[PDB]
Every structure is written in C-alpha cells, then in structure tokens.
A paper describes a structure:
Additionally, both DT homologs maintain the pinched disulfide loop at the junction between the C- and T-domains. Given these structural similarities, and for purposes of clarity and simplicity, we refer to these two DT homologs hereafter as Albireti Toxin (AT) and Peptono Toxin (PT).
Experimental phase for the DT-like protein from S. albireticuli was obtained from a 2.7 Å SAD dataset using selenomethionine (SeMet) derivatized protein crystals. 48.25 °C), the homolog from S. peptonophila (S.p) is significantly more thermostable (Tm = 59.5 °C). In ATR and PTR, the 16 amino acid insertion between β9 and β10 contributes to an ~25 amino acid “lid,” hinging at ATG550 and ATN576 (PTP571 and PTD596), that folds back over and occludes the presumed receptor binding surface. Attempts to unmask a cryptic HBEGF binding site through genetic deletion of the lid in ATR proved unsuccessful, further demonstrating a lack of receptor recognition, and suggesting that the lids are not responsible for the lack of binding to HBEGF. By contrast, in AT and PT, only Y54 and E148 are absolutely conserved: in both, an Arginine is seen in place of the H21 residue; and in AT an Asparagine is seen in place of Y65. Remarkably, the T-domain of AT lacks His residues in the T domain entirely.
Numbering used by the authors: 6 to 218, 229 to 587
The structure:
C-alpha cells in the first residue's frame, strides 16, 4: 500500500476557505449548506464535501477566479482528524492520495484498530459507499496535501453533514477586513461578479495582498514612485532631449539603441546609486533585444491607452535577459537594483517604441513600460531561495520554452470505477538560455461531453505564493471539443519558477466503449492533447487549431507560440 491514515491532534483547530463574492455574502449570515453549493464541492460523489485550507494563504491562492475573500472556520475539538500520509518516508506525495479506492483501503485499515465501524467497501461495490459521506457518519475529517506541486500545504476535507453542524459564530467573515476583497458596489447584483475591469483590478489588489499576508517577497509596488520620478528626471535632462522630443515610428536599429543604452545606464546609476559593491544587472544585448520586442508589440497591437500599452509590455518575451533580476537579486541592495533595472527597462523601451498619439509623448510610453515591467516582476519571488522543480518526462521545447508532464499523463477511466482524474504538466524555461522569460497567456485541453468533463473548480495554475487567476471557457466546435484557461494577470515563466498546470476531469461509463473496429477510437476524446501558449497568436490559429489532430505543428509552422503535449486515455 502506498498511502496510510493516522489520527493527529492539531494545536489549532482553525481552517480557512476561499470563496466567491456570492459565497462570502452568504456565509456572513448563514451556515454551510450542501444544498447551497452547486457542485457540492466536487463533481465526484466520492469526494463531495466542504474543502478548506490549512492556513489563510493556501486558501487565498486556491481561488482561481472571481475572488470574494477568505473566511476563518473553527471546527469542534471532538472531530477526529485523519491525515493521509505516504508509506515511503522519502515521498511526501502520492497520486493514491487522490483516488477514492486507495484512500478507502487506508481509512478502513485505520478504522479496524481504532474502534470505528466502516462499510466493507470493495472495488466492486465502491459506487454504493461515497467516501466523504461515509466518514461524515463517523465524526471524521481528512487532512491531505494540496497536490504534488504543493506538498507542504494541506486541505481539510469536511463531510457536508458535519460542515453543516458548525455554529455561525464559528464562521469568521469580519475580524480581518483585509480577508474581504470586494465591496458590494464592485459587483452586479444580477451576476454578483465584478461590474467592470476597474472593479476587477481593485479586487485583485486586495486578493494579492491577502495572499502574501511578507510571504511573496519584495514588494515591487513599493518603488513605483521612485521609478516614475527617476524616468521623468531622465527625460528633463537636456542631454536626452532627443528622446524627449522624439516622434514618428519605432527605432529597432541595434547600433542606435546601443548608443542610448550607454547614455542611459550611467545616467540611471547617477539618479539612484546602487550600494557599495553592487552592480547593475541590465545587459546591453538583452535590453536592446527586449526593447525591439516592445516596439514590435506596440505596432502590432495598436495600443490605444496607457494601460493597454502597459499590458502589452508585460507579455513581451525576454524581459529576464534585459533586467537580469528575474531569478535572483543581490541581497545587499535589492531596493536600489529594483529601482535601477525597471527604470533602465522602461527607458530603453521609451527609445524604441513608436510614439503613438493615444499614449502621449515618448515619456508616457516609458512610464507605461515601467508599470508593465513592474507588474511582471511583482509576481516573481525574486530574492527568495529557488525551489527544486518537479521531475518531468516527455518534454517539448519551442522558442526557449519547455512543456512536460509531471508523473503519468494517462487518464484512466476505471480505477476501479469512474471518478475524478487528473494530470499535471509544467511550463519551463530551457536552461540553454538561463535568464530567458516568456508569458503564460493561456492553456487549453480537449474534452468530451459526458465522457471526459473538465472540472473548472479543480483546475489549478501554480508557481509560488501568489494566486494565478484564469478564466475557464468551454469552447464551441466539435473538432475538437475543447476548453481553455485564460490567465487574468501577467504570468511569467522563469528558470527558477516554472508554472504547474493541473487539469482535472470526470470520467464515466461512457468514456471508453467496447466493440469499435479501431482500437484507438475506443476512448473519447480521440487524439487527446493539451496545449500551452506563451506568445502572440498566429493568424487563423487558436487553441482549437493546435488541439486538432490536423495541426501542422512547430516544424511546418515555426512562427507558432504554442506547445502541444499529447496524452492517452484508457478504459482501465
Ligand atoms: Ca512581489
């Protein structure tokens, strides 16, 4: 057996839970209710329950969209807390932790020597004994690691019948005002979701802040005032009047931009000298290369506003080779380096982009680039120790980015019966360019209605202590049937911080069928695959173009910014 269960006695019987605005409003004046939950916490009956987190941060960063806030739950002392553990001391995670049958065996083994009577669940009759419902008849909750990519954080799984017995005064939604990310006027009463992007940005700020309440590292926002003044000081210097008064199209000549670089780098270090011994991390070749990228981005996307120009800057590839601090930063003067490198980044962009009337003068583009660059770096844990990445298999590289599977990518329909199944892949930077970076813009996957149903509640995109919002979408079309997750703030792949994507699906008795003439069509969807995009769209190529078995691929279409990972589906 791979997993085991043992009762623990926690020092604090306090869990947390991230909720949408509607649920946060509900919980302020009602108790938890299975009927009020549209999914009952999980598409899989074995797992239907109330899910909670081991601390406020884990719950905060496992909201994936439409964040409302985080509530604090105090559960009774008489509840038995059963922790799922690996039988191998080296391995803290095992995929059996997620499968109803192995877990069933593990609690049965514990119950037998601990005076708890549980049904005689078998691989045959498992459909008749739903795990969490059955533990709810016995005063049991489950403690479990969040996932293979977050083994040190844990979810507490609370059977609904017990969740419903928690008193109201034990559900805290008020003592910390920062745990409530929205105000009522931010939402539409009919949808009870944010009215507009202004609201979404406001909620995101409170969401981000709470998730790091610092756990996230350097607060890049703390230096916007300095960076803005600094850039403005440069543009008032008479020696830079040629930048200040520049009009017309972009400047992408590498000699020309190098000339600005060597005029700008010393100037920036004068306005905010770095502390003794510390040196600038900006490189000529990367800044020139990156600035050209911003200029190409400004033209192609016709930026009609400051924020549009800032957004476009945040998803330009190669920022890490220009700022030099995407993966590490000199701890002797982190503030000075942040102020120094962003300012350099934005000034170089201001020298290369076209000067578009909607933006303003060249200075305005520079300031817009600074906001964009700062947003990118804000979500990287610079200056904190680098994480050991998860081992991968079957990698595929394109334009310096690498997608690969963590563990097994196969989706088995019966294990031993249908249920919630999942696979995980990582998006990494290829180490040949150790400081390269690229945006994660969207991920997509095949589906089959009634056969392989993506579970939007349990899809996750993970990197560090920040949440990673995305919008889940079931797409139109039958060739193939597909879904996409659109990331909702600048999400950046780095060497030291790859992004982990978990896709969860429900399988059914209809996933695989017998009797078909071709053994490869026995399971739907046929030709299964996922896809990750880290650059601009190619005309007439969307996620459904790539997922299709008819996609030409990166060799025929090297301009693409997609990587496609196939996987296989099997009945048992
Ligand atoms: Ca930060």
């Amino acid at each position: 057996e791979n997993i085991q269960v043992a009762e623990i006695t926690p020092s604090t019987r306090i869990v947390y839970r991230g909720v949408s605005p509607a649920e946060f409003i509900y919980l302020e004046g009602n108790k938890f209710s299975r009927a009020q939950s549209p999914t009952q916490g999980n598409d899989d009956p074995q797992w239907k329950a109330l899910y909670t987190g081991s601390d406020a941060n884990v719950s905060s960063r496992n909201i994936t969209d439409n964040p409302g806030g985080v509530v604090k739950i105090e559960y009774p002392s008489d509840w038995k807390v059963l922790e799922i553990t690996s039988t191998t001391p080296s391995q803290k995670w095992h995929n059996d932790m997620g499968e109803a049958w192995p877990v069933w065996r593990a609690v049965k083994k514990w119950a037998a020597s601990n005076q708890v009577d549980l049904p005689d669940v078998t691989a045959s009759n498992i459909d008749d004994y739903l795990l969490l419902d059955e533990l709810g008849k016995k005063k049991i909750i489950l403690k479990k690691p969040i996932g293979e990519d977050d083994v040190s954080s844990h979810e507490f799984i609370i059977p609904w019948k017990m969740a419903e017995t928690v008193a109201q005064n034990k559900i805290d939604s008020t003592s910390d005002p920062a745990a409530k990310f929205f105000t009522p006027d931010d939402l539409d009463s009919t949808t009870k979701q944010p009215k507009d992007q202004a609201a979404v940005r406001r909620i995101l700020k409170k969401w981000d802040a709470y998730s790091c309440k610092s756990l996230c590292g350097i607060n890049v926002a703390a230096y916007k005032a300095d960076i803005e003044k600094l850039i403005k000081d440069v543009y008032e210097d008479p020696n830079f009047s040629d930048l200040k008064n520049r009009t017309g199209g972009p400047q992408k000549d590498k000699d020309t931009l190098k000339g600005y670089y060597e005029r700008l780098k010393p100037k920036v270090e004068t306005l905010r000298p770095l502390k003794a011994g510390v040196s600038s991390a900006v490189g000529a070749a990367g800044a020139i290369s990156w600035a050209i990228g911003v200029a190409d981005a400004f033209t192609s996307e016709n930026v009609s506003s400051f924020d549009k120009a800032a957004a476009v800057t945040a998803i330009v590839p190669g920022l890490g080779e220009c700022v030099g601090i995407a993966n590490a930063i000199d701890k002797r003067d982190p503030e000075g380096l942040i102020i120094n490198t962003i300012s350099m980044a934005a000034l170089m962009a201001s020298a290369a982009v076209p000067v578009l009337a909607p933006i303003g003068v060249a200075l305005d583009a520079g300031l817009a680039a600074a906001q964009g660059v700062a947003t990118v770096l804000e979500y990287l844990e610079i200056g904190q120790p680098a994480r050991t990445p998860l081992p991968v298999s079957s990698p595929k590289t394109h334009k310096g980015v690498t997608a690969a599977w963590v563990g097994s990518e196969r989706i088995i329909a019966h294990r031993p019966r249908p249920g919630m199944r999942q696979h995980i892949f990582s998006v990494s930077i290829d180490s040949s360019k150790p400081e390269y970076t690229a945006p994660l813009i969207e991920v997509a996957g095949v589906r089959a209605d009634g056969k392989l149903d993506p579970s939007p509640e349990w899809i996750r995109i993970r990197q560090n202590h920040y949440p990673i919002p995305f919008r889940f979408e079931k797409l139109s079309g039958d060739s193939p049937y597909a879904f996409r997750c659109v990331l909702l703030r600048p999400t950046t792949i780095t060497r030291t911080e790859p992004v982990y994507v978990t896709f969860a699906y429900m399988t059914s008795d209809m996933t695989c069928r017998t009797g078909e003439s071709d053994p490869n069509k026995a399971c739907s969807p046929n030709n299964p695959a996922i896809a990750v995009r880290f650059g601009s769209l190619v005309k007439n190529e969307d996620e459904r173009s790539v997922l299709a078995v008819t996609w030409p691929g990166p060799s025929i279409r090297p301009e693409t910014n997609w990587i496609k990972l196939p996987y296989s589906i099997h009945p048992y």
